[PDB]
Amino acid sequence: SGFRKMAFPSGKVEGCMVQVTCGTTTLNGLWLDDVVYCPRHVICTSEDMLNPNYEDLLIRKSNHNFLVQAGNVQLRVIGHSMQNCVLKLKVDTANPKTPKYKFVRIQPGQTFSVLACYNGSPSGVYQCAMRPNFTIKGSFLNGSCGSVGFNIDYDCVSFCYMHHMELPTGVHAGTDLEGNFYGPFVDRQTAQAAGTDTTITVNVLAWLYAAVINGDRWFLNRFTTTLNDFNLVAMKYNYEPLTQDHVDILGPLSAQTGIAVLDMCASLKELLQNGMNGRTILGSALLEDEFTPFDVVRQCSG
Amino acid sequence: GFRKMAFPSGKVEGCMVQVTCGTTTLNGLWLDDVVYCPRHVICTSEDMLNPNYEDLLIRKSNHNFLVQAGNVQLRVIGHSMQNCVLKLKVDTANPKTPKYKFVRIQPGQTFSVLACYNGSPSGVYQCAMRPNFTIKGSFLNGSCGSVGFNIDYDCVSFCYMHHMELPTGVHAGTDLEGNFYGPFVDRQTAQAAGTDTTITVNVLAWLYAAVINGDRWFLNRFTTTLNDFNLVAMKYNYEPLTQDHVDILGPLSAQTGIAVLDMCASLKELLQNGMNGRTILGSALLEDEFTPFDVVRQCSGVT
């Protein structure tokens, strides 16, 4: 208790959502400056989807085959190209609502806000974490493809995810805005499975730091560990190994609490090896792994 | 498959402004030519324990209120007070004003909160009005005047404006007519709420959402009467389930083929036996901040 999944305000992204239709297939696109970005599978029929030859499908398309609309207002397409698994449609109008933006490729464990959209119209916004197996636990229905994930820093929207597909287990897979899938997945209506997932250690550590900030610190011990020794133990409990970048992003919380990252790792190691022994942290017997260090600082300090 | 989802916040973002009086800054809501904000913006340290708001406000002038929309100051040309909300008339209409209404929500209903600081939106999340008229929010210093809302088609229904945090860490505020939800008062005192209870109809809605997403370990072959369920519910500090609630749950019952009173028998077993390590939709606790409409709207893709 005290913490909750908080999305970024979605208005700057709402002002970029359009719909893209090829034939009877409509999905969402992202309109930035004079380009619309969308999943390339908009060009597929039902039949093309098992083993689509995207290069051949696209060669048969022309600009005038793409219906791009902001609401019910058509946006004329003046060029088209494919970049990995995304289609880029050049349009004749620069989006007047284009925010300051960048395209970023996030790492597992990072969280982002999803603006779920259908027919170019936003339905809802929620926070997702990229799992270590490169899937997200979204809420996506038919027509949701092309919905995007993003973070906002100062005036700037960092787009990090575009939605493409649902796996058999009900989790979701997609690309960055350069069209490169997160994980090993491909945009084909074939049998694909996510890898066995693991716990996001860096975020559990952030959660333990949050607990300390809130005065809940019974699990702190007098010991430390090396990063390698911790990582070898963590893997035995299906926790992800830490990277150097993870150590770095815990820096601010380590400084705020005075607890060295490797000392907190030793405390987590003891929790893994001994369990909670009927105790709670921040009111729960379960350790949370979907709040990043940035999320904690956002909710603890503003 | 099922997530706590807020409404897209853009229509509300376009209405948020900063309001300053003295050394106090908070947020206001700019609709047409009026800015709505919490009246405690006019209080100082010497006033806040027992503020005679009518007396404090008559001593202020229009120019004591600094309203800023981004990098632009809005000239206040009049002011009035309605319960705990101040209404600052400005000389400029907001062209981003959405179609809107002001509503007062009932306990157990949900809404989205756009948390703002210094007139700038910072985050969006879904909340419920608790049975004890608090909200379990995430609000820091400077968040007052942040609003809660629902969206239907093109129309924003504003239902909450933020005023205060209680010692337990929950939150209290008003509707957009300035009337508090609950027994709280806009004075600088530690205030306790009445005993909270769990929103039973919402727990049932969420158990249906779990079944929809293929989670069904908690179902059983038994049933209960409505009254016998309610006796147990009350014992566990759960709200009573009314026949209207049963009716409201019909579409979810029809979808999953599980009678409402059969789901009540499952919930009764969970209350008496616990979850014993298991989780439902990733949660170790029974979740009560999804309404039946929220579950349906998210299983139907409404925009």
Ligand SMILES: *[C@@H](O)[C@H](C[C@@H]1CCNC1=O)NC(=O)[C@H](CC(C)C)NC(=O)OC[C@@H]1CCC(=O)N1C[C@H]1C[C@@H]2C=C[C@H]1C2
């Ligand atoms: C907005 O102006 C602000 C929002 C608060 C700030 C912290 N988190 C929020 O959501 N509202 C206030 O500061 C109000 C103003 C009152 C209504 C004139 N007061 C408020 O929220 O007070 C909260 C603090 C912290 C918890 C608590 O019990 N309490 C009350 C004060 C009064 C007594 C002295 C200090 C504590 C106890």
